[PDB]
Design an enzyme around this catalytic site. Sequence first.
Site, mmCIF file in Angstrom:
data_model
loop_
_atom_site.group_PDB
_atom_site.id
_atom_site.type_symbol
_atom_site.label_atom_id
_atom_site.label_comp_id
_atom_site.label_asym_id
_atom_site.label_seq_id
_atom_site.Cartn_x
_atom_site.Cartn_y
_atom_site.Cartn_z
ATOM 1 N N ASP B 169 0.764 -0.948 0.487
ATOM 2 C CA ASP B 169 -0.139 0.032 0.026
ATOM 3 C C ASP B 169 1.208 1.456 -0.367
ATOM 4 O O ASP B 169 0.912 2.737 0.376
ATOM 5 C CB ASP B 169 -0.908 -0.185 1.185
ATOM 6 C CG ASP B 169 -2.363 0.848 0.861
ATOM 7 O OD1 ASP B 169 -2.668 1.029 -0.427
ATOM 8 O OD2 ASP B 169 -2.698 1.972 1.785
ATOM 9 N N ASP B 187 2.107 2.001 8.016
ATOM 10 C CA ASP B 187 0.857 1.261 7.644
ATOM 11 C C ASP B 187 1.544 0.469 6.874
ATOM 12 O O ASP B 187 1.809 -0.201 5.964
ATOM 13 C CB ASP B 187 -0.130 2.143 6.589
ATOM 14 C CG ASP B 187 -0.834 3.474 7.858
ATOM 15 O OD1 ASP B 187 -0.455 3.824 8.427
ATOM 16 O OD2 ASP B 187 -2.207 3.292 7.422
ATOM 17 N N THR B 204 -3.987 -0.179 -3.168
ATOM 18 C CA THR B 204 -5.348 1.874 -3.484
ATOM 19 C C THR B 204 -5.498 1.308 -5.402
ATOM 20 O O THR B 204 -4.208 1.476 -5.943
ATOM 21 C CB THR B 204 -4.424 3.091 -2.697
ATOM 22 O OG1 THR B 204 -4.375 2.741 -1.847
ATOM 23 C CG2 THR B 204 -4.828 4.124 -3.817
HETATM 24 C C1 LIG Z 1 -0.208 7.355 7.647
HETATM 25 C C2 LIG Z 1 -0.877 8.508 7.256
HETATM 26 C C3 LIG Z 1 -2.175 7.667 6.773
HETATM 27 N N1 LIG Z 1 -3.613 8.911 6.643
HETATM 28 C C4 LIG Z 1 -4.360 7.822 7.316
HETATM 29 C C5 LIG Z 1 -4.313 7.966 9.402
HETATM 30 C C6 LIG Z 1 -3.012 7.561 9.375
HETATM 31 N N2 LIG Z 1 -1.568 8.309 9.008
HETATM 32 S S1 LIG Z 1 -1.091 9.725 9.631
HETATM 33 O O1 LIG Z 1 -1.901 10.200 10.836
HETATM 34 O O2 LIG Z 1 -0.598 10.302 9.331
HETATM 35 C C7 LIG Z 1 0.565 8.424 10.922
HETATM 36 C C8 LIG Z 1 -0.160 7.436 11.027
HETATM 37 C C9 LIG Z 1 0.951 6.655 12.024
HETATM 38 C C10 LIG Z 1 2.305 7.517 12.574
HETATM 39 C C11 LIG Z 1 1.994 8.623 12.289
HETATM 40 C C12 LIG Z 1 2.880 9.135 13.266
HETATM 41 N N3 LIG Z 1 3.298 10.602 12.800
HETATM 42 C C13 LIG Z 1 2.054 11.106 12.707
HETATM 43 C C14 LIG Z 1 0.925 10.688 11.574
HETATM 44 C C15 LIG Z 1 1.056 9.216 11.737
#
Ligand SMILES: C[C@H]1CNCCCN1S(=O)(=O)c1cccc2cnccc12
Lengths: 19, 353
Positions: B169, B187, B204
């Site tokens: 992904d 992720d 996606t």
């Molecule tokens: C990977 C993105 C993808 N969009 C959907 C929500 C998840 N996020 S996030 O909230 O920005 C996020 C996820 C994991 C760890 C993080 C660490 N620091 C800051 C944000 C983070």
Amino acid sequence: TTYADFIASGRTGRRNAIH
Amino acid sequence: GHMGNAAAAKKGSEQESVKEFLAKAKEEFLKKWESPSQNTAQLDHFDRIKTLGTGSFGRVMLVKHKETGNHYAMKILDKQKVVKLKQIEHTLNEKRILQAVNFPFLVKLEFSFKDNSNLYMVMEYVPGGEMFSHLRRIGRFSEPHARFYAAQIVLTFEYLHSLDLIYRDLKPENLLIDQQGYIQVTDFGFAKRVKGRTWTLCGTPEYLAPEIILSKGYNKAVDWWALGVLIYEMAAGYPPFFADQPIQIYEKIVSGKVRFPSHFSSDLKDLLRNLLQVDLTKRFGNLKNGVNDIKNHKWFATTDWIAIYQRKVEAPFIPKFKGPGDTSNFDDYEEEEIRVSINEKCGKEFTEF
Ligand SMILES: C[C@H]1CNCCCN1S(=O)(=O)c1cccc2cnccc12
């Protein structure tokens, strides 16, 4: 333009996965 | 040939050293995969500050550890929703992967725990925001800027694939920019240990490899296809295959046709034709020479792979950073209370978490 076509697709925002 | 004696020897040695690194990293991963960690904190150890992002899984919040004052990103999953959405295995697997991997561009899991209602994964806070936001705001990245990010993904996939992990992904939405301008991959819900082939339809639409769309057994080459999509989107500002609806995107993906902006360099177009190759027997990253076909391509000729790994390259872009806990590079989301419950939910399903 190709950019205009992209805007027209409506898929310029965050894209969800298939699930 | 293309290399004289000194350059050929240096490249050969570099490639052998990668093998040596990866063999050690596999040993270390398998040790952690077999003897993991668990229940390393609890909810009232943190102040919850602001939602950084959301999904059907739940939300990610900025939190501050009370005892230490450090900020973290806490992913909160509602167990009942995870079960309803049939994501039990994915959620357990994501945590197991995060607990076991170690690489400079893979987000680090700092704590995990659960309560009657929710699962909690406390990760490093990556303050620079999503690549997605920066890309849409700036429009497109220059080829050097795109190349800097692409190199980090190449190395990360070289690492993951050595562990037999397919990522599945990749997209700018899932790539965060840290305070030094480097990438963090976060992720792992769709990642899978796959030494051979696997069959799940997941990912996606814009980033799906043709063999996924066509319901074939597929392998780690789908990640190299997705790299091609990412590089294209970073350098163009839009992906190679788009349309109003996913089925139209899929028709374009499987067609074997891709078009490039006039500002793409020839080196870039050549790399992308070899990544966005519908024929598996011809796709870079899937040939006898493996990842070296990518790392040694002309478009990466200026890339010092070791210096990228060591984070000694000056990043093309440093996000704004006002201090710890600055959330300005993230969007605003409706805040919702996290209710626990006096009754344990889905205990059996999440025993291993
Ligand atoms: C990977 C993105 C993808 N969009 C959907 C929500 C998840 N996020 S996030 O909230 O920005 C996020 C996820 C994991 C760890 C993080 C660490 N620091 C800051 C944000 C983070």
